[PDB]
Amino acid sequence: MEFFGESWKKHLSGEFGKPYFIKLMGFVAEERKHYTVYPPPHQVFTWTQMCDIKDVKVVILGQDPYHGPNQAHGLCFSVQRPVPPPPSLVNIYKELSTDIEDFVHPGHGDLSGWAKQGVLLLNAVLTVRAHQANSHKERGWEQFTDAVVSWLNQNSNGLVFLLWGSYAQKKGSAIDRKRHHVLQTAHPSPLSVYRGFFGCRHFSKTNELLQKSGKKPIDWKEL
Numbered sequence: 588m589e590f591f592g593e594s595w596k597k598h599l600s601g602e603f604g605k606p607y608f609i610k611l612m613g614f615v616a617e618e619r620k621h622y623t624v625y626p627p628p629h630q631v632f633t634w635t636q637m638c639d640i641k642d643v644k645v646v647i648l649g650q651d652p653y654h655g656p657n658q659a660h661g662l663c664f665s666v667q668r669p670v671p672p673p674p675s676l677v678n679i680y681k682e683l684s685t686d687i688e689d690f691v692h693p694g695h696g697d698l699s700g701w702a703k704q705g706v707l708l709l710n711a712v713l714t715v716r717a718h719q720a721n722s723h724k725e726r727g728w729e730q731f732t733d734a735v736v737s738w739l740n741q742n743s744n745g746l747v748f749l750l751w752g753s754y755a756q757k758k759g760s761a762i763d764r765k766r767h768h769v770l771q772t773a774h775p776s777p778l779s780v781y782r783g784f785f786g787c788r789h790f791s792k793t794n795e796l797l798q799k800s801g802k803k804p805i806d807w808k809e810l
Contacts, residue, residue: 590628592635598742602734611727615714623717625652626659631713633661637702643739644705644802645793646748648755651712651721659715662708664775665698672696678775678784683807686788693810700810705803709735711758733758740767745800747793751775751784768796 588596588603602608618624626633649663653673658666664676672680676696683690702708711732716722736758739746746767750759752774762769770789773782794804 588632590630590636591632592637592640594639594641595632595635598640598738599735602731607727607730611731614726615723618714618716618723624714625654625717626661626714630659630661633699634702634707634709636661637699638705642705643707643743644746644797645701645805646707646709646736646739646746648736648748648750648758649708649710650752650754651724652710652715654715654718654720654722656717661713662698662702663710664696665708666696668695668697670696674777675775678777678780682775682785682787683790686791687807690790690808695810698810701805701807704805704809706805707739711754729758737761743767745797745802747796749789749793752779768793 588600615624619628647663652659652661652663653666655670658670658673660667664673664679666673666676673696680690680692684692698706698708709732712721712724712726712728713732714723714728740762744766748759748762748767748769750756750769750771755774756771759769759771770787770792772787772789773779773784775784790805790807798804
């Protein structure tokens with residue numbers, strides 16, 4: 588695999604040879620031949636390119652990538668300029684405006700600044716056919732992302748997992764609550780944000796936790 592961070596490849600390359608992954612790449616390769624597939628190949632693994640796997644401190648689980656032109660680019664809840672922050676991200680910024688005193692809305696929805704600090708913005712499914720949500724589900728990506736989640740679960744220490752919504756809470760249901768910190772709440776989406784996300788204060792909490800264990804906190808305003 589290309590466009591895949593070396594530090595991550597060194598620990599996860601074992602997945603590339605497994606049958607489920609091999610079949611997966613073939614399905615994706617076949618899809619790209621007939622339709623437009625997001626994100627483009629060089630951005631499918633952006634989450635492995637923003638920081639060394641050893642610097643991962645926070646994990647935010649997402650589901651499917653955005654299926655609109657130039658929206659998805661490898662990180663969950665993130666969109667490239669000049670795409671405006673989607674409803675869910677505006678609510679994320681809203682919570683931050685009350686939870687983190689120095690946070691400022693940057694106007695854009697590009698979360699690369701967080702990924703650079705060790706915030707793994709991982710979607711469960713990494714590709715999607717243009718304008719067809721969930722089109723690439725149950726093709727092999729989930730087995731891969733679960734493999735990634737599992738590696739981090741068994742090999743890291745003191746990570747903070749942010750599980751927002753039903754899909755993420757289910758996928759993160761196996762995280763060791765003793766070895767790691769798991770914060771859960773409603774999905775930031777307008778349809779469920781009022782059920783608990785507003786007021787969850789997960790960003791301030793994440794930093795209090797990271798800092799307590801002697802780790803570098805996330806400067807959320809650094810986007």
